[PDB]
Amino acid sequence: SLPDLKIEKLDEGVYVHTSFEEVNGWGVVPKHGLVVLVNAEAYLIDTPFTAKDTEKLVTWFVERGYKIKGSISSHFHSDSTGGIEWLNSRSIPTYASELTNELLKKDGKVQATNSFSGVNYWLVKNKIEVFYPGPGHTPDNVVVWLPERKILFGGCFIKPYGLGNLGDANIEAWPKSAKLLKSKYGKAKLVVPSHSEVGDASLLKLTLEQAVKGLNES
Ligand SMILES: [Zn+2]
Numbered sequence: 001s002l003p004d005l006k007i008e009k010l011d012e013g014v015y016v017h018t019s020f021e022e023v024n025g026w027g028v029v030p031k032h033g034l035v036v037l038v039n040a041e042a043y044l045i046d047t048p049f050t051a052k053d054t055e056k057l058v059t060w061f062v063e064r065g066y067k068i069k070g071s072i073s074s075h076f077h078s079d080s081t082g083g084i085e086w087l088n089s090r091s092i093p094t095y096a097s098e099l100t101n102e103l104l105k106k107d108g109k110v111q112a113t114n115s116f117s118g119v120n121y122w123l124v125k126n127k128i129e130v131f132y133p134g135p136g137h138t139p140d141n142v143v144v145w146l147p148e149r150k151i152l153f154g155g156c157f158i159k160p161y162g163l164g165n166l167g168d169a170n171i172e173a174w175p176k177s178a179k180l181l182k183s184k185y186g187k188a189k190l191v192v193p194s195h196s197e198v199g200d201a202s203l204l205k206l207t208l209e210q211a212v213k214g215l216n217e218s
């Protein structure tokens with residue numbers, strides 16, 4: 001019996017959603033994403049693992065008057081993409097990078113309806129920016145920056161205490177990607193990782209350090 005979907009306010013117009021899946025031999029692992037409010041409209045930054053929790057997430061905001069305008073998935077893994085099928089089935093616009101959709105397609109998974117590429121992509125102009133630091137955790141990992149709040153959603157790229165699942169990781173590239181991310185967003189007030197607690201800009205340095213260490217021992 002998995003823990004309940006959790007939704008709580010982080011800052012003005014920004015909620016953290018947490019969903020849980022059993023994965024071996026980790027036990028139960030929490031996964032954090034965001035919901036970002038733009039007036040009376042809501043954007044999902046990552047989806048929960050399941051249709052059911054995606055539905056609960058969507059319904060929570062819909063029942064409070066917010067129309068769901070879209071979701072963005074930060075990488076191809078199920079902890080960021082598990083709700084894309086559901087959201088597509090409800091005609092809610094989904095977004096992923098062109099590299100993320102290619103990895104989904106290749107793995108037999110339903111793709112985001114919209115895609116983008118490049119270093120920077122504005123999902124919402126001046127409000128929600130998507131940045132591609134380069135390969136790290138996965139080949140396609142992106143991050144999401146909220147310039148008005150100085151909040152960076154780092155997803156599974158930000159790994160301040162250890163790199164985590166290396167299966168699809170580019171250990172050779174991660175230091176350079178982590179270096180670029182740090183230099184881009186050292187101004188961040190809050191950095192929100194996927195599987196640990198919210199922190200400040202130091203998580204960027206800690207991630208770089210973890211990436212460097214991981215490269216050296218391989
Ligand atoms: Zn992942």
Ligand SMILES: [Zn+2]
Binds near residue numbers: 077079156194195
């Ligand atoms: Zn993850």
